[PDB]
Amino acid sequence: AAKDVKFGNDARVKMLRGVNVLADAVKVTLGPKGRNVVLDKSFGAPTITKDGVSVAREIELEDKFENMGAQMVKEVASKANDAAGDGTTTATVLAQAIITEGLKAVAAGMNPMDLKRGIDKAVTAAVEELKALSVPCSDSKAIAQVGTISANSDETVGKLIAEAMDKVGKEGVITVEDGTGLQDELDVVEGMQFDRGYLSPYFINKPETGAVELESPFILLADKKISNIREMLPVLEAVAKAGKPLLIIAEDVEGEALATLVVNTMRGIVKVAAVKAPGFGDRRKAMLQDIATLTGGTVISEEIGMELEKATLEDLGQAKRVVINKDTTTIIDGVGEEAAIQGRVAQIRQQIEEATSDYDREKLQERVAKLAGGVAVIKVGAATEVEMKEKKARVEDALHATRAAVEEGVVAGGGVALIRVASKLADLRGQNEDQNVGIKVALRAMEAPLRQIVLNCGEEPSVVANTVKGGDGNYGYNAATEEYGNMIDMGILDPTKVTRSALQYAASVAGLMITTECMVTDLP
Amino acid sequence: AAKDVKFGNDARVKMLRGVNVLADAVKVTLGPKGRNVVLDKSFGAPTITKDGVSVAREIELEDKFENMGAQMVKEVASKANDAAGDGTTTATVLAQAIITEGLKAVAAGMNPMDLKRGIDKAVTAAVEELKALSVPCSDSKAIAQVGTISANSDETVGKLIAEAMDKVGKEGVITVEDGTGLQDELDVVEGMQFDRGYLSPYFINKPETGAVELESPFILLADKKISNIREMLPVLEAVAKAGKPLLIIAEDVEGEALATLVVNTMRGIVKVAAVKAPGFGDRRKAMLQDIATLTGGTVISEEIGMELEKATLEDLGQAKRVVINKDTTTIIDGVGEEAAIQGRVAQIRQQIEEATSDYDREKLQERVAKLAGGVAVIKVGAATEVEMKEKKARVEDALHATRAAVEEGVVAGGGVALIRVASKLADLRGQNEDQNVGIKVALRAMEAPLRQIVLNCGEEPSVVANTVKGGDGNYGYNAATEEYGNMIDMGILDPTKVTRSALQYAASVAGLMITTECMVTDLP
Amino acid sequence: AAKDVKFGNDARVKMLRGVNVLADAVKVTLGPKGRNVVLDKSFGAPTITKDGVSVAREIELEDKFENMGAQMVKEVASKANDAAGDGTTTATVLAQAIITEGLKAVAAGMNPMDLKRGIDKAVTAAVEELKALSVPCSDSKAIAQVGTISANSDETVGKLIAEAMDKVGKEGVITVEDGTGLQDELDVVEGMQFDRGYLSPYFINKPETGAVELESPFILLADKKISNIREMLPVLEAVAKAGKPLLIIAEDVEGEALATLVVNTMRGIVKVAAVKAPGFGDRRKAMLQDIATLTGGTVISEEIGMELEKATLEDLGQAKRVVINKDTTTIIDGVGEEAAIQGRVAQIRQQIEEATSDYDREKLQERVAKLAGGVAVIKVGAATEVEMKEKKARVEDALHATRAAVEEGVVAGGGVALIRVASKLADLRGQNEDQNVGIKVALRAMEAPLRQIVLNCGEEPSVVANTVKGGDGNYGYNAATEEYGNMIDMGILDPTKVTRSALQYAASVAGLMITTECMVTDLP
């Protein structure tokens, strides 16, 4: 299509108005005194969130150029989310900030490219700075503090999270789902368990709800379905002999097997029942050895050097007992040596450090957690639906933040850390003048977070900022209590990693953005 | 698409006008002196209802922003309905109320977020308060009162309902359908019965209409059709022997079986006939044991350890007699021990407390009712169709209300309860001032219901409210009689549960809504 | 879509304008001096009717709100028609009436809901009232008068109708079809006969036109066709033996059977021929036992304990003779005891009182009429088509009216009955004042029918009405003769049932309608 090109100032301005719109719409939601925004939806009802990135995405401008600018800054708010799922709003604030000043300096007649470098440098510096102040977040107390501070000051949250982490361990998995009631609720799975119910409902051991509890069973693992392939009685009878209950796992099972199986377990011939493995081919099969090895079983290489009956009763794995309903199965404890356990674990180390990261290390550590650790789930409380969302939302942020503080430590919130490291680079200089401004520009912008927070409190951003800058170390203003003091003792912690990503991602784009001299796009 | 963002006051205002329109359109229908609204329909003729939620849903505004606010509030009216199918209008009124005030305070320059909290707390407070006033609704009288009150003061209703409940019991099922005549009618099913007619019309016992009355039959249950699988004569002849009638149930039956069956029963060889089981696989099957077990029969596990003929005459169940037409079948009474009954029932307790609730516990309790209790249906009378609707509509609310009153008691109507609990929290305070206002705001809104009611009577909302606030306990204004007194002795009861849901759901949204600082949506 | 809500007076007004348009367009056709309206049609040529309900349906307004009003009143006009196929126009007038007044009183500042009750009660009252005055319409004279009066005063009609009923009986069926000439014509079927011609055209007995007259035949009924299934000669020869003609009925007959049959009836071996049974499966079959039992035959349960040849010549039914063409068969008389006749009739009593009514009791009563009574059809005379329509139309109204007068008696026309019972409720009062007005309103409206009729004669509606009200009993104005007197002796009768439905249906909606406070619809 025919284009519309714009150069210099004109373009820039447009670009800026664009940024501001986006920015302004995300600022409103910063800090404890942060406010909400409503995203309309033709879909169902409008959405009410305080999640910066959530907002960003919805912003699109009619002015093709004002729009481009917005479409750009939008990615910082975005990347910031992919990085550590929080700090999004904050990051955005900084760009808005950097850009404003930057442009003003380009308008000042400076070479933009050096401004960029000056900023870049200024940032690389600021980063080491943070890494310096970053201090280990390890105790449950600290962990609940970031949770809480992340979930717009909700202790119940940090509290809950703190606990989960304290249970499932370090590699234990944690997820949030909408709860039933209005109270938040924490459930923690113990041992090995997945999402497969029994195909033989008739095979319900003791409790109802389809509760099966095969006491001291032999576990069986295969690689096929058993319609009429019922052949395998040697294996069967083998246990009928030892008089032990039996659990099975494979592609599937047809009535032919079940039917007979039924009356057998009935007549008190052999108390048994079975449930399908995990899910997809590579999936399920991927997850069995682990199971076998766990209970000390010998998975059946139906595809390799094994067959149906082709397998002795001793191949079977053994566990205290099991618990099954119409949807899930759980092994109380497959007696399997730790030489085996940590072994099947050690080999997970390569799986872990993977270049796939997302979706890979997810379902990955899951088993990892089930192969020794513990799995946890959180249910969010909310009367309405428009509440259940927002709530559950923040809950995750925090869930993330903690994850980050742990791996990368923390620093002082209230955007003090930055304002602090800023003073530390008061003497940073670069190759030429422009560059020095470029730096100065950046430092100057690092007061953004802080004073937006303040402003979201209807108070003098500049006045606070001063008194705060007059202080040292972790002296900081507490927006919530409206009084200064030590940000850490007050439990106002920001996972070091977010603060860093926010600054980086922010600059990464801001920088470029301010080096626009021309812009092309379609006609109105 | 290109968006249109609005911040602060502008946005709010718009949002509010939006709310108002909706609200205002729902108010009109509040109380005995509430009026109706007409909802247009391209479909057929317009609809005339006084059901708040019915109205809500139809409201959509041209102004994108005004619309959003409307689209939000709409959910309280909604959720309120999913909760206890009544109080919808009332709920709405409170939001309208809360928001108005709220915004006024934000306009006053207060932190919205604290306002929210102030409100939330004031509410959590207000709830215990109600649970205090809630008093058990257990006698048929009270129950008749809520139904009546619910059905805009129609005694006939509460009366009818009260009856139904008094019959089918507590776990007895109750449903409402359109009636033939103009009078309302109550039918109550006794014992075991379902929606299945006979495949062998020839096999009609005594009365007409397809009336079968197998005196002292042997009930038979299967898991497959019987085209030429007619093999089973043993079982058959086994009764030709005993000379007792026989009832059958299964996936189906082809004439092959029927044909011969006809002349057998004819010649006086064997008085018999059969009808299809419930409906879907897991369905029908899920419902048979009960049947069997009830009548003392042995369901045929055509899929498990059994086969056609594979079964003895004693396996069959026995019942006083049965009654069948071309659409329904009924068992007079299958002689089956209570140990069995309450048993088959007890195991329903898990089915009962289910995380499925909607649709689950529905068809669930149904059987639960047929499994010892009773099933009832109500036919609403109406001359027209636009009448049958409205009518049958209100009849259900009541139906629900009562259901709610029973499980959660009641409190004083006329919106006195609230107005009362408000005085009780006159000393409630929060962490800061804004929050205290946030509380005051809410308490203030709790007068809404009452004074909208009054206003729907062309009377001083503020003057009544006063004299009402001057009183104590259940002193309250009777809009209908236009004179004060004891709301309970006057039988003006609100199922505690609705009053509570209305307040919660209302606030849950209003709360958020008043913390809007920006709004985004598409362009006009 | 974006809506447009309207409250109070505004809404009401619009609504009313809507009603009026509709109403006014239907009024014009009320009474002997009623005029016509033309309904356009893209289809073919415009339609010219005086049938109120025909009109109503065609009315749709551009003003969404004016339209809603009209879409609602439209239902009274409608329902009135489903109820008893006449009085439509009349009904409408009352609504128009009720509403007008009603609204005026709401405008007066009265509680609408009481208004409604006032009206409702006033009506329930008015109904017993009518049931009082209703007097049995039994003599043919009376019956001709309602037909006549119904068919806008056409004696020829009431005359013809009276006859029919006098013939076919009470349960005899009567239908109207376009006739051939210009004179109306009445045909009356005697005995048993349906719409099936002979497959064996060659088997014509005596007259032409395919006229068959098997003297003292043996009727034969089956449940299948006969291509090569010609096997059955035993039964055949058994008659060749007896030497009697033969009639056959079944799913069909192939030439194979026919061919041979031809020459057989030809060479004088066996005078026979056959014709297909009724129509659909459950249709035809449903209609055979009846045929059998009548002539005294044994239907062939080709599907049950019976086969082809499998049946003795005695099973056959017998009849005096038959008459068939290429489209119709008829049994002079199948000697079949009345024990069987009325038996097969008595069991029709449940078929009769069926919760189906529409479509059921139709084809049902049909056979019923053929199983003892008589069947009649009327052919309407008209030069044109636009005439044949109108004509035939009114003819049915009367056909229904009579039906109604018969079952529910009659009362004095000219809208006197109502105006009369109104005076009777001059002292009716309700729980409060608003309600008394509500009542008064209604009574006042009952003068509508009468004075619209008067107005349709260019005369003082108020002057007549007065003199008419001064009178007693059935004193009434005769619009046609323009002179007062006894409405009954003049034969100006209205089937009690319609008069009643028109009032009920009318109020039923009107009532609700005047309680509108808001209205929602889409934008223009």
Ligand SMILES: Nc1ncnc2c1ncn2[C@@H]1O[C@H](COP(=O)(O)OP(=O)(O)O)[C@@H](O)[C@H]1O
């Ligand atoms: N009570 C408080 N007083 C002062 N600063 C706070 C307080 N609570 C949180 N903060 C700071 O304000 C920031 C608010 O971040 P937030 O608004 O959630 O944006 P993001 O989406 O970027 O986290 C926190 O990261 C922290 O630095």
Ligand SMILES: Nc1ncnc2c1ncn2[C@@H]1O[C@H](COP(=O)(O)OP(=O)(O)O)[C@@H](O)[C@H]1O
């Ligand atoms: N006769 C009466 N006098 C006073 N208050 C009444 C009377 N009848 C009902 N009410 C009160 O007014 C409310 C009206 O409820 P309604 O108009 O149906 O709204 P919702 O659909 O929210 O219940 C009742 O719930 C009760 O609190």
Ligand SMILES: Nc1ncnc2c1ncn2[C@@H]1O[C@H](COP(=O)(O)OP(=O)(O)O)[C@@H](O)[C@H]1O
């Ligand atoms: N000559 C007459 N004088 C007085 N009243 C009459 C006369 N003819 C008919 N009527 C009355 O007017 C009615 C006319 O019916 P009609 O105009 O077709 O309206 P609808 O279709 O509502 O019956 C009759 O039912 C009867 O009540």
Ligand SMILES: [Mg+2]
């Ligand atoms: Mg955050």
Ligand SMILES: [Mg+2]
């Ligand atoms: Mg209600």
Ligand SMILES: [Mg+2]
């Ligand atoms: Mg008429």
